[PDB]
């Protein structure tokens with residue numbers, strides 16, 4: 001199960017915000033989210049299980065950030081981005097996402113793991129400027 005991964009246990013010891021998705025199910029829904037993620041976003045565990053985590057995005061989310069994630073997942077690459085997300089009540093926050101594939105012995109992706117960090121406006125600005133300049 002989700003909490004059987006040693007890196008998941010490690011993240012829990014530090015109370016990180018993370019989710020686990022299941023890409024064997026159509027549209028790669030969330031199948032676990034940590035308490036920090038639920039408090040951050042305003043959703044109960046049962047309500048987020050079964051949703052693709054794109055439910056956190058909205059009209060002011062930059063589609064280029066989303067596309068970078070999409071392509072990373074497609075290309076088998078670790079991906080790190082900052083993008084605007086939305087709580088259940090419509091309020092917004094900047095979210096730094098760290099996404100990786102969890103793989104079996106033959107390389108098959110068995111789950112994805114995504115760590116989330118709420119960051120300040122100032123930090124999001126600095127990060128996105130660096131990302132751009134580095135491009």
Ligand SMILES: Cc1cc2nc3c(=O)[nH]c(=O)nc-3n(C[C@H](O)[C@H](O)[C@H](O)COP(=O)(O)O)c2cc1C
Nearest residue numbers: 019021052053054056057066069070112113114116
């Ligand atoms: C493990 C995992 C965790 C994710 N965490 C979130 C997140 O907190 N917020 C968000 O906007 N997208 C997150 N995503 C990204 C969306 O689920 C989706 O991959 C992204 O929108 C790109 O796919 P799409 O272009 O089909 O929407 C996560 C994705 C994965 C695989």
Ligand SMILES: [Cl-]
Nearest residue numbers: 027028052073
């Ligand atoms: Cl996805």
Ligand SMILES: [Mg+2]
Nearest residue numbers: 046047048050
């Ligand atoms: Mg329902």
Ligand SMILES: [Mg+2]
Nearest residue numbers: 046047049050
């Ligand atoms: Mg559900």
